[PDB]
């Protein structure tokens, strides 16, 4: 398996991934972008707060005709939501990566989410019945998720130029 | 802009043969040299007719040659830039010296049997490089079925 962030070595880092996960790709993208670059304990606490509706995920790209809330003021937005299913899946993946770091012997309390990326998985093709004997797609858009945690951490001058510099050094 | 009521005319004559005969190419080189380095109009006419296509080189028969050999032309060298064919209606072939592009077998045999000589055009260039004492003959151009139907 090959992760997208190829510049990160595996010796002092932890990694986790999940594939074909039947959870909303757009909501998961917003949640992952919310926790991108954070410390691990802060991210876990934030995702539990998202489940408990005490902290909100700001909706930035996939936000068309959504609602507004007072909890977006922490992020400087008005559109924010509480994607519980995305938070649960990301909590599971983050806890797997924490267990991997504990197995590797890394210090858990100093870990940050260096890389986190949500990709689109192949779509689940259900169908729905419309009027006049028509059939439309009713598809699911699942996602692949990957995450990596790391530790928090005068040449070719002209002769006139040379002469000017020498004279200025002398005087 | 320059007002050009008249138009510069590109050439409407052959400057080179369309044929891929290598011996024809060598003959064309020889007669290009002769036409450049001589004053003889015969060489230029021969070169231009060497450029020509087959319908522009109709065959000349032995009876046509014998007709043109009369009235003081009996000792001249006959030059044809087409095929010389045999005419079986001509029962007695006169003695003649003929240079042609090619001969049919019966025409060559009958000329040699009457005692004349058969030459190619390079032999003609060797012996008469200025075309002296030659009789240049062409065949009937309009004697073709397409020309009749025109």
């Amino acid at each position: 398996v090959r992760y997208a962030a190829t510049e990160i070595a595996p010796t002092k880092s932890a990694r986790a991934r999940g594939s074909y996960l039947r959870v909303s790709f757009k909501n998961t993208r917003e949640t992952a972008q919310a926790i991108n670059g954070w410390k691990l304990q802060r991210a876990l606490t934030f995702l539990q707060n998202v489940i408990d509706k005490k902290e909100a995920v700001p909706m930035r790209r996939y936000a068309g005709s959504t609602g507004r809330t007072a909890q977006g003021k922490q992020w400087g937005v008005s559109r924010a939501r509480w994607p519980v299913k995305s938070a649960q899946f990301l909590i599971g993946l983050l806890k797997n990566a924490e267990a991997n770091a504990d197995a590797k012997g890394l210090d858990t309390g100093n870990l940050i989410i260096k890389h986190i990326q949500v990709n689109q998985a192949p779509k689940q093709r259900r169908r729905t019945y419309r009027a006049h004997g028509r059939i439309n797609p009713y598809m699911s858009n699942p996602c692949h998720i990957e995450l990596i945690l790391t530790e928090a951490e005068e040449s070719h001058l002209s002769s006139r130029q040379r002469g000017v510099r020498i004279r200025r050094a002398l005087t | 802009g320059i007002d050009l009521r008249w138009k510069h005319v590109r050439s409407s004559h052959r400057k080179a043969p369309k044929s891929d005969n290598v011996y024809l190419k060598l003959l064309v080189k020889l007669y290009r040299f002769l036409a450049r380095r001589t004053e003889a109009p015969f060489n230029k006419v021969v070169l231009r007719r060497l450029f020509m296509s087959r319908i522009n080189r109709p065959p000349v028969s032995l009876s046509r040659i014998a007709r043109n050999l009369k009235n003081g032309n009996e000792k001249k060298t006959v030059v044809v830039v087409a095929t010389v064919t045999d005419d079986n209606r001509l029962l007695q072939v006169p003695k003649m010296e003929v240079a042609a592009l090619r001969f049919t077998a019966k025409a060559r045999a009958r000329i040699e049997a009457a005692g004349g000589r058969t030459l190619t055009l390079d032999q003609l260039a060797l012996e008469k490089p200025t075309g002296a004492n030659t009789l240049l003959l062409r065949g009937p151009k309009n004697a073709r079925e397409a020309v009749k139907h025109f």
């Binding site: - | 802009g1 320059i2 007002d3 050009l4």
Partner: protein, 149 residues
């Protein structure tokens, strides 16, 4: 341009703008020039105009080709049968309109002049007598030739 002035300009060898030619004044040529007056400016050139035109912009027609007049051998080779063996003889023939004026003027390729240094009058396409540039300007053609050569 209508077909009759187009034909007259073609016969006068004025096929391009700022082309110029020498003409011997007869009635048969004067009526032609009078017809093509809405496209031409013409006049009476002096010796300085003639010699400077021939020296700076003199090209002979040799075997249909436009050859600069850089040696007297070209002039003698093409006009020697009429007694013109050098460029001064050619200038004399043009200026005095000798017995071989037709041959000398036709041997000269039509002069390709530049645009005038100083420009034209503000309304160029009126007659000279009305404040424009077209028509017969007589001896005033030398200023135009000086500006254009």
């Amino acid at each position: 341009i209508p077909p009759k002035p187009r034909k007259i300009l073609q016969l006068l060898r004025l096929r391009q703008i700022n082309n110029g030619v020498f003409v011997k004044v007869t009635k048969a040529t004067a009526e032609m020039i009078k017809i093509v007056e809405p496209w031409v400016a013409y006049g009476y050139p002096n010796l300085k105009s003639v010699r400077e035109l021939i020296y700076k912009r003199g090209y002979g027609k040799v075997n249909g080709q436009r050859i600069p007049l850089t040696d007297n051998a070209i002039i003698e080779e093409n006009l020697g049968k009429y007694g013109i063996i050098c460029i001064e003889d050619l200038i004399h023939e043009i200026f005095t309109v000798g017995p071989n004026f037709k041959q000398a003027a036709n041997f000269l390729w039509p002069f390709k002049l530049s645009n005038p240094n100083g420009g034209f009058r503000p309304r160029k396409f009126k007659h000279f007598i009305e404040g424009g540039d077209l028509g017969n300007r007589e001896e005033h053609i030398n200023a135009l030739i000086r500006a254009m050569n």
